[PDB]
Amino acid sequence: SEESQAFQRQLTALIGYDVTDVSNVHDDELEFTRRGLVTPRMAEVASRDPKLYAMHPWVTSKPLPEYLWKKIANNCIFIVIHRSTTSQTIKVSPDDTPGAILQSFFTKMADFVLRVCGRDEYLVGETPIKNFQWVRHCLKNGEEIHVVLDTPPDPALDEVRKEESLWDCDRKFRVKIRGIDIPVLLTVFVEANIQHGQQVLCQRRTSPKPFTEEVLWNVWLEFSIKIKDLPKGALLNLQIYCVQLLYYVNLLLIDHRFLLRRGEYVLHMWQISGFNADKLTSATNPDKENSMSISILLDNIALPRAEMPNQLRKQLEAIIATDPLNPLTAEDKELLWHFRYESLKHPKAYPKLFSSVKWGQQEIVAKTYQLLARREVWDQSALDVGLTMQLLDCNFSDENVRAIAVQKLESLEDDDVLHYLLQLVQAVKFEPYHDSALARFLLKRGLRNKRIGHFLFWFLRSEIAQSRHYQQRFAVILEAYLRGCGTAMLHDFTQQVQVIEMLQKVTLDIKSLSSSQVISQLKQKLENLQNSQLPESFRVPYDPGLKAGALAIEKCKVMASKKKPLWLEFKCADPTALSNETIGIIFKHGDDLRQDMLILQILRIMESIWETESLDLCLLPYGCISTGDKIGMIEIVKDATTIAKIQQSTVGNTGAFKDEVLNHWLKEKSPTEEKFQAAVERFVYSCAGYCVATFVLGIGDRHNDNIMITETGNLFHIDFGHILGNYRVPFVLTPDFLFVMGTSGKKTSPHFQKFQDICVKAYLALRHHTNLLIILFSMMLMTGMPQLTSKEDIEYIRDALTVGKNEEDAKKYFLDQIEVCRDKGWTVQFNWFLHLVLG
Ligand SMILES: CO[C@H]1CC[C@H](n2c(=O)c(-c3cc[nH]n3)cc3c(C)nc(N)nc32)CC1
């Protein structure tokens, strides 16, 4: 078709990569997968309720926590319905359905849908109003709940554009190397490995030859594994050391069709930088003008109850009970396997057990499967995500094991799927194949909920636009989602992309020039754009509810830092919006906004752990979307400053920090005094919040420049990309912080103990999720952190969370940590000032 060519040009510029382009491919896997997704995509589209999908209610089944119940007047919530101009303030019960809140109207001030004013959120379908996210957001931050009444949007706008044996030869496996060759340049050798999720099964080397632009061997490297002892998901890792490694590449030996790989391959290899998830990618380096290559040939076949002691039991229970990161001696691993039927009665163990498998052995594998048919306890166990993520990481490469974890994630409601989304997406870099339970899961879920679908889009787009190792695979998943999400959404994503592409040119261009002149160019270009370049409005990608209209040009300015971020403001586009509080977004280049993303996502997780215990530690995990490479957008938190700049009030050229200043500033910026006291509380709550979390994530030692506070009390950290991209005190708890809590020095106050009492309830609440927190951290480093991966980097968290220790020992350690701060006072900050501002 013609208006089908049309499409594949559109997608190709939403996606940001051309999924039809076949050069950088040595087989039809992406194609196969492109085709493969078509049935789970269509199936989900043919399944959604067109109404409930049109209005995308943001809803939760979690128990409405205490702190919010308490903030109630008496089983009585106030809702201010608007319409033309006038209002109406109905008294309603938290348990009242939104359909019913009209039987409190069609029979009160004497069909219609209820949209949150100024947002694209709707209160609909059978849920107790207590259960809507926006309601909860209103009860905490204590605003009123305003709603416009209007027409349901037309479900027909979510219209989708139509379209239609190896278990025998006991041959030892072998690899003919031919040789290697590289555009422009010693001693050198191919190293070949046969791997299954980090378990390295076999291994050979080549005889070191002089290092020249072409080096040939014609060797048969013969392996010790047998053609039938090969497992689906086995990679042939090829590497080139010269002794240091310089280049890598991988190839599956069992292709996506269950067929052993045959024939002739020439592969463009990946270079090194300056472990991580890119050394695992089945994708070859697109750059050919410059990439090192390796030539190979392939052989010239399809893949188809005892008792127990009383001390071994206690060796097992120890083993099972240990954290995810503690390694297992061969002695440990032989034990798990032997008593595997008993090992299966505990979900907690599946990781460790499935790691005890000798995957390079055909019969072991089968008994493994035999085990998996006896999966009962698991299928029945209450879903635990930390455990479930574990089976999705780089260690597990059996499709079927990975599959049991993904079946366990099917049981997550959308609220929860939004919490873990970013890590689940990253988790795709660990899938051996392109088409997996995990990718389809992500697919279904995005196609079933515009909110999830919105973020899925940016997450995938983010990886695509900067990962050369995963773009293809990700590009195929994106396209699958685009072809099923409705032209409504489709057209909506298009506006979004146009704008943010517009805005990056500006960012990078302003960056190129470096001052009074500049202010002008900025203003010049920003009105160059409010014509027929910029469309009239667009959704905010970090918050899909917010319609941004016109660029509030005056307020837009360029900032004062090494990187010259563009501070922008946006008139809300929605006229039902009961305020003029513009939308603030910062466009930055030069920092790994990704790293920020991962951290923030863990921040939002910590909050929803403290909530399981009616604890609210007042975090501000501001919206952050990475758009490209060292480039993206950040949400602006209103009415905030940097702690360094509050210090700069009373000195700049120096920062001879004074302890009085912050509490002066709060008093200075507090209207009544009922407020000032709340503000001081929110500080104490926020500050304790960041103190713990910052601590556990091991990005606690920062400098006041990177710490902000709102005019209303709330403290929060920013610019995570900085230290994680570059990398003593455990965390910033300065004297000026103390002074506010009412303790100049080594005294004590009813506010400080409040604080110190909060950190502990806090520090102990997370420890109930040791495993979870550990695995996420482990993953975040593999997927997002370059080089600072070692292994001892990972183990950092094992210390912080203090694996092994009982609750009491645990309270002591965090209190100690609070002490190194009381000790060091201003030292470290003053050290940073030296370093950062001058040294
Ligand atoms: C020069 O003046 C600066 C202007 C920009 C300010 N700034 C940031 O840099 C970052 C941020 C997040 C990651 N990198 N940067 C976040 C940030 C947030 C969330 N809110 C606000 N109200 N300002 C922020 C900081 C002061």
Cα 11 to Cα 77: distance, rounded to the nearest angstrom: 45
Residue 728 structure tokens:
């003593």
Would you say 467 is a known binding-site residue?
no
Are the C-beta atoms of residues 124 and 114 closer than 8 Å to each other?
yes
Alpha carbon of 718 to ligand 1 centroid (Å): 7
Write the residue with the smallest CA distance to atom 25 of ligand 1: 642
Residue 254 DSSP label: B
Q: Measuring CA to CA, how many Å separate 739 from each of 143, 187, 735?
A: 30, 63, 6
Q: Where are the domains of the chain?
A: 1-163, 168-300, 301-486, 487-638, 639-830
Give the length of the chain: 839
Are the C-beta atoms of residues 646 and 657 closer than 8 Å to each other?
no
Are the C-beta atoms of residues 423 and 384 closer than 8 Å to each other?
no
Cα 837 to Cα 839: distance, rounded to the nearest angstrom: 7
H helical segments located in 557-710: 593-610, 643-648, 661-668, 674-697
Would you say 699 is a known binding-site residue?
no
Cα 413 to Cα 814: distance, rounded to the nearest angstrom: 35
Q: Measuring CA to CA, how many Å separate 205 from each of 175, 247, 249, 838?
A: 11, 15, 15, 50
Cα 425 to Cα 456: distance, rounded to the nearest angstrom: 8
Would you say 627 is a known binding-site residue?
yes
Are the C-beta atoms of residues 81 and 105 closer than 8 Å to each other?
yes
Would you say 624 is a known binding-site residue?
yes
Cα 439 to Cα 33: distance, rounded to the nearest angstrom: 10
**Which conformational region is residue 229 in: left (phi greater than 0), alpha (psi within -120 to 50 degrees), or beta?**
alpha
Contacts by 349-354 with C-beta closer than 8 Å and gap 24+?
Answer: 349/319, 349/320, 350/378, 350/387, 350/390, 350/391, 350/404, 351/324, 351/387, 351/390, 351/391, 351/395, 351/396, 352/319, 352/320, 352/322, 352/328, 354/391, 354/396, 354/398, 354/401
Q: Which fold has domain 301-486?
A: 1.25.40
Q: What are phi and psi of 742, to 5 degrees?
A: 90, 50
Kindly report the CA angle at 459 between 545 and 26, in degrees rounded to 5? Answer: 150
CB-based contacts of 168, cutoff 8 Å, min separation 6: 228
Q: Which amino acid is at 8?
A: Q
Cα 830 to Cα 658: distance, rounded to the nearest angstrom: 12
Residue 476 structure tokens:
């195929």
Are the C-beta atoms of residues 224 and 172 closer than 8 Å to each other?
yes
Alpha carbon of 567 to ligand 1 centroid (Å): 9
Residue 19 DSSP label: T
Would you say 716 is a known binding-site residue?
yes
For helices 661-668 and 674-697, give the axis angle rounded to 10 degrees. 130
Cα 614 to Cα 68: distance, rounded to the nearest angstrom: 9
CB-based contacts of 687, cutoff 8 Å, min separation 6: 715, 733, 737, 755
User: CB 828: neighbour CB atoms within 10 A?
Assistant: 18
Cα 604 to Cα 693: distance, rounded to the nearest angstrom: 11
Cα 412 to Cα 392: distance, rounded to the nearest angstrom: 16
Write the residue with the smallest CA distance to atom 23 of ligand 1: 636
Residue 111 DSSP label: -
Question: Is it true that domain 487-638 has CATH number 3.40.640.10?
Answer: no
Are the C-beta atoms of residues 662 and 736 closer than 8 Å to each other?
yes
Would you say 590 is a known binding-site residue?
yes
Question: Burial of 617 by CB count in 10 Å (0-12 exposed, 13-18 middle, 19+ buried)?
Answer: buried
Alpha carbon of 640 to ligand 1 centroid (Å): 9
Are the C-beta atoms of residues 283 and 277 closer than 8 Å to each other?
no
Q: Which fold has domain 168-300?
A: Immunoglobulin-like (2.60.40)
For helices 5-14 and 471-482, give the axis angle rounded to 10 degrees. 120
Q: DSSP E strands: which ranges in 157-211?
A: 172-181, 187-196, 199-205, 209-210
Residue 836 DSSP label: I
Pairing of strands 631-635, 707-710: unpaired
Concatenating the DSSP letter of every residue in 599-644 gives: HHHHHHHHHHHHGGGT---------EEEEETTEEEEEPPTTEEEHH
Are the C-beta atoms of residues 554 and 519 closer than 8 Å to each other?
no
Would you say 703 is a known binding-site residue?
no
Half-sphere exposure for 33 (CA within 13 Å, toward CB): 27
Alpha carbon of 628 to ligand 1 centroid (Å): 19
Alpha carbon of 721 to ligand 1 centroid (Å): 12
Residue 336 structure tokens:
């798990």
Alpha carbon of 559 to ligand 1 centroid (Å): 10
What is the dotted CATH code of the domain comprising 1-163?
3.10.20.90
- The dihedral over CA atoms of 641, 643, 647, 648, expressed in degrees to the nearest 10, equals -50
Would you say 620 is a known binding-site residue?
yes
SS3 200: strand
Are the C-beta atoms of residues 225 and 358 closer than 8 Å to each other?
no
Out of 594, 708, 709, give the residue to mutate to test ligand 1, the one with the largest number of ligand atoms within 8 Å of its CB: 708
Closest to 717 measured CA to CA, from 620, 651, 627: 620
What is the dotted CATH code of the domain comprising 639-830?
1.10.1070.11
Residue ranges lining ligand 1, Cβ < 6 Å: 559-561, 586, 596, 622, 634-637, 640, 642, 718-719
CB-based contacts of 339, cutoff 8 Å, min separation 6: 308, 312, 316
Cα 397 to Cα 346: distance, rounded to the nearest angstrom: 21
Out of 634, 707, 720, 726, give the residue to mutate to test ligand 1, the one with the largest number of ligand atoms within 8 Å of its CB: 634
Alpha carbon of 323 to ligand 1 centroid (Å): 36
Alpha carbon of 541 to ligand 1 centroid (Å): 18
Out of 564, 583, 586, give the residue to mutate to test ligand 1, the one with the largest number of ligand atoms within 8 Å of its CB: 586
- Do the first three CATH levels of 168-300 and 487-638 match, i.e. the same topology? no
- Using the atom order of ligand 1, give the atom closest to the CA of residue 638: 22
H helical segments located in 26-114: 29-45, 52-55, 66-70
Write the residue with the smallest CA distance to atom 4 of ligand 1: 559
For helices 450-464 and 487-512, give the axis angle rounded to 10 degrees. 40
User: CB 313: neighbour CB atoms within 10 A?
Assistant: 12
